[PDB]
């Protein structure tokens with residue numbers, strides 16, 4: 211439905227969250243649909259964290275981070291923190307901590323993705339993380355649509371923020387305000 | 391000509407199917423095919439990284455990178471086990 | 481399905497009756513290694529770590545008469561480097577190894593199934609007579625041991641990065 | 653029946669009009685000895701690799717990727733200018749694609765059509781006449797690319813340049 215010229219493949223079911231008939235290039239046939247679906251949800255989240263991160267870091271700095279950062283923006287900080295870590299700074303191991311912990315989360319959840327492909331009860335992208343219980347208390351499946359849609363928006367937005375940074379040093383908040 | 395002894399727990403491993411039974415994986419008979427395939431790719435990347443970081447070998451090589459470099463041949467046997475487990479429905 | 485990890489499947493080799501059961505085996509390592517071997521290995525780690533965590537804490541609190549002369553300032557791992565030069569580390573190693581030689585025999589009995597994993601029948605004072613207090617206390621030993629495993633690594637790494645030692649790191 | 657390619661020779665028995673690029677051309681009878689479906693899929697795979705190879709031998713005349721912009725336009729020198737990490741990644745990618753033909757031929761040989769690796773993302777071949785035309789077009793363009801790459805490769809051996817460069821400089825002959 212999204213592209214009238216080239217509709218979505220019959221491989222895509224219509225009862226999945228975020229289904230709005232958009233697959234003109236038919237990429238679903240090449241790879242397992244469950245693997246692709248979980249890949250999109252994982253990209254959604256990592257991007258959403260990055261998009262909110264890019265905005266927040268420009269908007270606010272935690273106390274004492276400014277001295278190590280100097281004046282680096284969202285992409286620059288990563289290079290600066292690793293450069294200081296190369297020198298041997300204990301304070302500059304922040305990147306290593308997040309790499310270790312995100313990797314640990316991926317390593318513990320490693321079986322889960324294959325279990326979804328194997329036919330296990332877990333649906334792709336669901337880890338049953340509801341401490342708030344907002345989805346359980348309310349109706350689930352409307353926020354799932356919001357999570358995929360906002361995630362797609364964030365995916366594109368993170369690309370916008372990074373490429374804008376590489377061309378011109380300005381990060382997100384500054385780039386939106388200024389109009390070169 | 392006399393009974394040939396085998397260790398206790400020796401079972402039959404001759405196969406003519408698409409894949410051998412998972413019993414040929416020994417202690418890894420119950421591991422899922424996804425778990426071997428992910429362990430195989432993980433072992434290939436960390437083993438290749440650990441191998442690559444010490445290719446100019448020094449009189450002080452990092453012992454963890456040497457030990458981690460053994461994951462590259464181990465990854466070969468892991469993906470063979472991944473193929474065996476997928477073809478056994480595991 | 482699993483209690484601790486809701487998305488993943490219930491671990492096949494793990495049961496509620498076993499002490500410290502939360503259904504936690506995300507990597508499925510119970511299939512790879514014999515569960516009785518794993519259970520005894522966990523209990524051995526739990527007890528050695530429990531002694532080690534309390535050890536670090538107690539050594540910061542106080543030392544035994546004369547140890548301060550033998551090791552001038554090194555604590556945690558550093559005192560071990562001094563004690564291999566003296567005889568304390570070797571003598572403890574000789575006696576722990578001798579007990580582990582009987583432990584090897586006990587491990588063989590456990591793999592047979594004759595002996596429960598980690599059960600060396602050591603009750604000088606009988607605090608597990610009730611047999612439900614025994615279930616609770618085994619759960620406590622496992623839980624405090626897992627915590628101590630984490631804690632022992634935590635405080636030793638604090639020594640590696642700062643040299644302070646466990647209590648001193650908090651005080652400084 | 654007689655061959656349509658060679659009208660004085662009898663029709664080779666194990667090739668048929670059903671196959672997309674059929675011309676009746678098997679003067680030395682490979683298909684009466686080898687499996688015709690194995691030869692079919694093998695011909696199709698050689699052609700697909702050669703179609704990319706022909707395009708790949710011609711394309712760095714026009715433009716290069718920015719990383720390999722410094723590399724030579726002679727393909728047989730650009731072969732050695734690529735790093736072995738690069739060739740290892742190319743080999744790993746080709747191998748991943750082959751894992752599918754390993755299933756399609758060494759295990760699932762009879763189920764399907766030769767060369768049918770389930771790669772139809774834009775949902776072509778839905779219209780049957782269009783499917784027929786595309787099948788014959790793939791086989792003929794693959795054979796043409798095999799001949800063309802064979803040419804352009806040996807032309808790059810004789811004159812150490814790309815085929816288009818050899819053409820414009822008119823270095824058509826061994827010198």
Ligand code: CLA
Pocket residue numbers: 255256258259261262263265266335336337338339340342343344345346351353354356357360
């Ligand atoms: C618009 C945001 C949004 C929405 C609606 C959802 C919706 C959902 N998620 Mg997803 N998720 C998101 C973002 C979102 N997610 C991001 C960014 C992460 C990464 C941390 C995750 C990680 C995640 C996991 C790991 C899991 C879910 C799960 C769920 C479900 C639980 C229902 C629920 O209570 O969530 C309601 C959620 C919200 C209403 C979002 C609240 C956002 C507020 C505003 C906080 C923002 C804080 C942020 C850091 C500040 C940004 C502003 C800054 C720039 C100034 C539902 C499908 C669970 C699931 O599918 O299984 C049942 C599950 O296992 N999500």
Ligand code: CLA
Pocket residue numbers: 528529530531532534535536538539542543544545547555559560563568579600602
């Ligand atoms: C993993 C355990 C472990 C290890 C390797 C060490 C190692 C060491 N300790 Mg520490 N220590 C421990 C536990 C440990 N301790 C515990 C639990 C305490 C609290 C009582 C202490 C309190 C302590 C002090 C106060 C001092 C040391 C000191 C030392 C050093 C000299 C040896 C000595 O005098 O120990 C003495 C330790 C003890 C007398 C208590 C340990 C006795 C345990 C309970 C043995 C039990 C084994 C068990 C029953 C086996 C069961 C067998 C089963 C099969 C049936 C050495 C670095 C000295 C040092 O270097 O300080 C800087 C020192 O002065 N230790």
Ligand code: CLA
Pocket residue numbers: 235236237701702703704705706707708709711712715716717718720721723724725730731734738773
């Ligand atoms: C048999 C095929 C083949 C082989 C062995 C090579 C080998 C090489 N090429 Mg050539 N190349 C090829 C095909 C090939 N190429 C094709 C088809 C093109 C046109 C796009 C090019 C264009 C090209 C340029 C512009 C450059 C190279 C370069 C190189 C070298 C470095 C690797 C690289 O960047 O490759 C790039 C090769 C590709 C990107 C081809 C990918 C072919 C895939 C498999 C087909 C894609 C399938 C289809 C699009 C899927 C769509 C799905 C649908 C949803 C849309 C190496 C010697 C570089 C060099 O050193 O030259 C001096 C360089 O700068 N190649």
Ligand code: CLA
Pocket residue numbers: 699700701703704765766767768769770771772776777783786787788789790793
């Ligand atoms: C002339 C080329 C040509 C044609 C007609 C076909 C035709 C076909 N292929 Mg095939 N294929 C080709 C080349 C071609 N292929 C090459 C080179 C490869 C290797 C990358 C493949 C790999 C491939 C696989 C792996 C599979 C097929 C399959 C199919 C069939 C169904 C899909 C379909 O209808 O696509 C129609 C395709 C076209 C109409 C080709 C047009 C492509 C574009 C529009 C033009 C070329 C663009 C080019 C990259 C840019 C040139 C730049 C330059 C001019 C400057 C059909 C028989 C599938 C099947 O089931 O087979 C039976 C299957 O599994 N093909």
Ligand SMILES: CC1=C(C#C/C(C)=C/C=C/C(C)=C/C=C/C=C(C)/C=C/C=C(\C)C#CC2=C(C)C[C@@H](O)CC2(C)C)C(C)(C)C[C@H](O)C1
Pocket residue numbers: 258259261262265339340341342343344345360361363364365366367368369370371374381382383384385386
């Ligand atoms: C889910 C879950 C939990 C949780 C949680 C969490 C952490 C939820 C977090 C949700 C978040 C952080 C959502 C943020 C999405 C970001 C978007 C859509 C931005 C896109 C970028 C755009 C539009 C742009 C842009 C830009 C361009 C390119 C150039 C820039 O110069 C400027 C500009 C800005 C204009 C809880 C605890 C609630 C429990 C619950 O039971 C389950």
Ligand SMILES: CC1=C(C#C/C(C)=C/C=C/C(C)=C/C=C/C=C(C)/C=C/C=C(\C)C#CC2=C(C)C[C@@H](O)CC2(C)C)C(C)(C)C[C@H](O)C1
Pocket residue numbers: 702703704706707771772773774775776793794796797798799800801803804807815816818819
């Ligand atoms: C399958 C599929 C699709 C697809 C697709 C794709 C990627 C299709 C790719 C098709 C390609 C790359 C075809 C290239 C063919 C090249 C040929 C025939 C060259 C021959 C060279 C010759 C004759 C020569 C020569 C030379 C000689 C020897 C002498 C020289 O001096 C000069 C000269 C140059 C003349 C899509 C993605 C649309 C989706 C769909 O749902 C399914």
Ligand SMILES: CC1=C(C#C/C(C)=C/C=C/C(C)=C/C=C/C=C(C)/C=C/C=C(C)/C=C/C2=C(C)CCCC2(C)C)C(C)(C)C[C@H](O)C1
Pocket residue numbers: 260285288289365366368369370372
């Ligand atoms: C950390 C680090 C770095 C980094 C980094 C990062 C975070 C890089 C992130 C890169 C990303 C996320 C790029 C994505 C861009 C989105 C695109 C191109 C969408 C295009 C839209 C399309 C095609 C069509 C859209 C369409 C339209 C018309 C609207 C409707 C929808 C649709 C029909 C689909 C480095 C690399 C600099 C290294 C450095 O050492 C430090």
Ligand SMILES: CC1=C(C#C/C(C)=C/C=C/C(C)=C/C=C/C=C(C)/C=C/C=C(C)/C=C/C2=C(C)CCCC2(C)C)C(C)(C)C[C@H](O)C1
Pocket residue numbers: 314556557558560561629630632633634636
């Ligand atoms: C080398 C040396 C010496 C020494 C020594 C010693 C004593 C070395 C001991 C090292 C130890 C015990 C390290 C422990 C590491 C534990 C880890 C990383 C677990 C982390 C928790 C994780 C990943 C997640 C936890 C989790 C959390 C947060 C929430 C999710 C769930 C959960 C799983 C609970 C000597 C003495 C010989 C001296 C010699 O001269 C040099």
